[PDB]
Structure 1
Amino acid sequence: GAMAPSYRVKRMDIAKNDEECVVNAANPRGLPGDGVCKAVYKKWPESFKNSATPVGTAKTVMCGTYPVIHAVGPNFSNYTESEGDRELAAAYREVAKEVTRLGVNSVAIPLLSTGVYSGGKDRLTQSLNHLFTAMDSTDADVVIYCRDKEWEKKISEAIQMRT
């Protein structure tokens, strides 16, 4: 565990993280994909061997000794708001199980279902609150990665509000 488990946010490419493992915002088919998934494919392509897994689940594959946790959030273009909310919560619960099982002291995590799976809706708060619900009982240092300057501010505010 970390000595004083924390949440932090950084605005940069998650493929350049300084943590002991990474969460990929994966597709269910283990394809290279776009956005975070394509950056993860370029950095850790070995981790996409048998990485296909259903919506609402996470599957870990090692790149050398570095763990890549493939977490499959729902595409809100296809799911109802109700069913999508349930699957997005479940994907983060499976990430917390994997982080715990691996025994890492830190994890880099993107906000699932906030990009091309958002159905064009702002889901910062929805996705971040499911992240907190899952990860609050873990003792890893969590570092959230984003690309937008206004999102960095809003994620940082949400973290500081609870401290």
Structure 2
Amino acid sequence: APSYRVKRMDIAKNDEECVVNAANPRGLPGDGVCKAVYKKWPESFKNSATPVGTAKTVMCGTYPVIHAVGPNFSNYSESEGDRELAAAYREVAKEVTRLGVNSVAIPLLSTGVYSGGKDRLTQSLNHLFTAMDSTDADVVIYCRDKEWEKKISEAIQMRT
């Protein structure tokens, strides 16, 4: 029976069969979060460039890295941002299904340096749910803040 779980820890130490990288459209290593993914799976960044609102899988050996590019809300309108953030998660669902994996480690896209200084926990998480509800993979959501862990954990609780 496929579950959603949340873990407050480095996504680069996930124990799922694949990872989603919160990526930039240039396929650049990045800093903070993407840096952890670059350091862990540097060969997954070969031709990882993909436009905003898309996802691209690059294998690191047999381990799939799904580069998913949420919008930078600094650059987008609230309405266009929202559209691009929905589409990014939909492309993630498609890659997870295509790969036939049983589990996936996923961050909340567009909630860090791409949030345009706003709190987007509920926006990002609902788009994730919309996309991943139609898949049969175990989903493990990774976050850093304890407050965020609690809020995500409750949003999971109150749909079961």
TM-score category of the 2 structures, normalised to the smaller one: over 0.9
Q: Which moved more, 1:138-147 or 1:32-41?
A: 32-41
One of 95, 100, 111 as aligned partner of 2:97: 100
Query: How far is the alpha carbon of 1:39 from its aligned partner?
Result: 0.5
**Whole-Å Cα distance in 1 between the matches of residues 90 and 134 of structure 2?**
10
**Whole-Å Cα distance in 2 between the matches of residues 30 and 9 of structure 1?**
26
Query: How far is the alpha carbon of 1:105 from its aligned partner?
Result: 0.1
Q: Secondary structure at the match of 1:47?
A: helix
Q: Give the equivalent residue in structure 1 for 2:63.
A: 66
In the alignment, structure 1 segments of 5+ residues that lack a partner are: none
Using structure 2 for the length normalisation, give the TM-score.
0.99
Q: Secondary structure at the match of 1:96?
A: helix
Q: Secondary structure at the match of 1:10?
A: strand
**Whole-Å Cα distance in 2 between the matches of residues 137 and 56 of structure 1?**
19
Query: How far is the alpha carbon of 1:35 from its aligned partner?
Result: 2.3
Q: Give the equivalent residue in structure 2 for 1:162.
A: 159
In the alignment, structure 2 segments of 5+ residues that lack a partner are: none
Q: Give the equivalent residue in structure 2 for 1:54.
A: 51
Q: Secondary structure at the match of 2:109?
A: coil
Stretches of 4+ aligned residues off by more than 6 angstroms: none
Q: CA RMSD in A?
A: 0.4
Query: Once the two structures are superposed, what CA deviation does each residue of 1:107-149 show, in whole Å capped at 9, x if it has no partner?
Result: 0000000000000000000000000000000000000000001
Query: Once the two structures are superposed, what CA deviation does each residue of 1:78-109 show, in whole Å capped at 9, x if it has no partner?
Result: 00000000000000000000000000000000
Number of residue pairs matched? 160
**Whole-Å Cα distance in 2 between the matches of residues 100 and 32 of structure 1?**
26
**Whole-Å Cα distance in 2 between the matches of residues 34 and 90 of structure 1?**
24
